[PDB]
C-alpha cells in the first residue's frame, strides 16, 4: 500500500517551505530596519521593546 | 518668526505663541490647552514614546 503524507520533496511541501522561509526573511528584514532606525520618532512612537 | 528662531534647542522644548487682546477669556483657554499638551508630551518622553 502507498503511504500518504505531506513530504518535503513533494511540490506542495516545497511551496509551503519556501513561503515560510520568505516570511522569516521578511520578519528579519523588518527587525533590522527597526534596529537601524531605532532613534526615529516614528519607531520610538510604537513600543520598541514590545 | 524672529522670536521663535531664537530657540536653539529645537528638540526638547516647544514654544506656543498667541496674540492675546480680544478683551476675552481665550487667553486662559490657550494656556490650559498648551499646559495639557506639555503634560502629555512629558508623559510620552517619560515613557520613551517621543
From Swiss-Prot, chain A:
Membrane-crossing residue ranges in chain numbering: 11-36
Region Intracellular loop 1 (ICL1), annotated ranges: 37-48
Cytoplasmic side: 37-48
UniProt modification remark: Ubiquitinated by RNF19A; which induces proteasomal degradation.
Subcellular location per the Swiss-Prot or TrEMBL entry: Cell membrane
Expression across tissues: Expressed in the temporal lobe, frontal lobe, parietal lobe, hippocampus, and cerebellum. Also found in kidney, lung, liver, heart, skeletal muscle, placenta.
Consequence of changing residue 4 to K: In HYPOC1; there is a significant leftward shift in the concentration response curves for the effects of extracellular calcium on both intracellular calcium mobilization and MAPK activity
Oligomer status and interactors: Homodimer; disulfide-linked. Interacts with VCP. Interacts with ARRB1.
Medical condition linked: Hypocalciuric hypercalcemia, familial 1: A form of hypocalciuric hypercalcemia, a disorder of mineral homeostasis that is transmitted as an autosomal dominant trait with a high degree of penetrance. It is characterized biochemically by lifelong elevation of serum calcium concentrations and is associated with inappropriately low urinary calcium excretion and a normal or mildly elevated circulating parathyroid hormone level. Hypermagnesemia is typically present. Affected individuals are usually asymptomatic and the disorder is considered benign. Hyperparathyroidism, neonatal severe: A disorder characterized by severe hypercalcemia, bone demineralization, and failure to thrive usually manifesting in the first 6 months of life. If untreated, NSHPT can be a devastating neurodevelopmental disorder, which in some cases is lethal without parathyroidectomy.
Record's function text: G-protein-coupled receptor that senses changes in the extracellular concentration of calcium ions and plays a key role in maintaining calcium homeostasis. Senses fluctuations in the circulating calcium concentration: activated by elevated circulating calcium, leading to decreased parathyroid hormone (PTH) secretion in parathyroid glands. In kidneys, acts as a key regulator of renal tubular calcium resorption. Ligand binding causes a conformation change that triggers signaling via guanine nucleotide-binding proteins (G-proteins) and modulates the activity of downstream effectors.
Similarity comment: Belongs to the G-protein coupled receptor 3 family.
Protein's name in the database: Extracellular calcium-sensing receptor
Originating organism: Homo sapiens
This protein's encoding gene: CASR
Parent-record interval covered: 601 to 650 of 1078
From Swiss-Prot, chain B:
Cellular compartments annotated: Cytoplasm; Cell membrane; Cytoplasm, Cytoskeleton, Microtubule organizing center, Centrosome
Residue numbers of ADP-ribosylcysteine PTMs: 47
Binding locations of GTP: 21-23
Binding residues annotated for GDP, in chain numbering: 21-22
Domain of life: Eukaryota
Ranges for region G5 motif: 20-25
Protein role: Heterotrimeric guanine nucleotide-binding proteins (G proteins) function as transducers downstream of G protein-coupled receptors (GPCRs) in numerous signaling cascades. The alpha chain contains the guanine nucleotide binding site and alternates between an active, GTP-bound state and an inactive, GDP-bound state. Signaling by an activated GPCR promotes GDP release and GTP binding. The alpha subunit has a low GTPase activity that converts bound GTP to GDP, thereby terminating the signal. Both GDP release and GTP hydrolysis are modulated by numerous regulatory proteins.
Family per similarity comment: Belongs to the G-alpha family. G(i/o/t/z) subfamily.
Disorder: Auriculocondylar syndrome 1: An autosomal dominant form of auriculocondylar syndrome, a craniofacial malformation syndrome characterized by variable mandibular anomalies, including mild to severe micrognathia, temporomandibular joint ankylosis, cleft palate, and a characteristic ear malformation that consists of separation of the lobule from the external ear, giving the appearance of a question mark (question-mark ear). Other frequently described features include prominent cheeks, cupped and posteriorly rotated ears, preauricular tags, and microstomia.
Subunit structure: Heterotrimeric G proteins are composed of 3 units; alpha, beta and gamma. The alpha subunit contains the guanine nucleotide binding site. GTP binding causes dissociation of the heterotrimer, liberating the individual subunits so that they can interact with downstream effector proteins. Forms a complex with CCDC88A/GIV and EGFR which leads to enhanced EGFR signaling and triggering of cell migration; ligand stimulation is required for recruitment of GNAI3 to the complex. Interacts (inactive GDP-bound form) with CCDC88A/GIV (via GBA motif); the interaction leads to activation of GNAI3.
Protein name: Guanine nucleotide-binding protein G(i) subunit alpha-3
Species whose genome carries this gene: Homo sapiens
Encoding gene, per UniProt annotation: GNAI3
Amino acid at each position: 500500500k502507498e503511504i500518504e503524507f505531506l513530504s518535503w520533496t513533494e511540490p506542495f511541501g516545497i511551496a509551503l517551505t519556501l513561503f515560510a522561509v520568505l516570511g522569516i526573511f521578511l520578519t528579519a528584514f523588518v527587525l533590522g530596519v527597526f534596529i537601524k532606525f531605532r532613534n526615529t520618532p516614528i519607531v520610538k512612537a510604537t513600543n520598541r521593546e514590545l | 518668526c524672529q522670536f521663535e528662531d531664537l530657540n536653539r534647542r529645537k528638540d526638547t522644548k516647544e514654544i506656543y505663541t498667541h496674540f492675546t487682546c480680544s478683551t476675552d477669556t481665550k487667553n486662559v483657554q490657550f494656556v490650559f490647552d498648551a499646559v495639557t499638551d506639555v503634560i502629555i508630551k512629558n508623559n510620552l518622553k517619560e515613557c520613551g514614546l517621543y
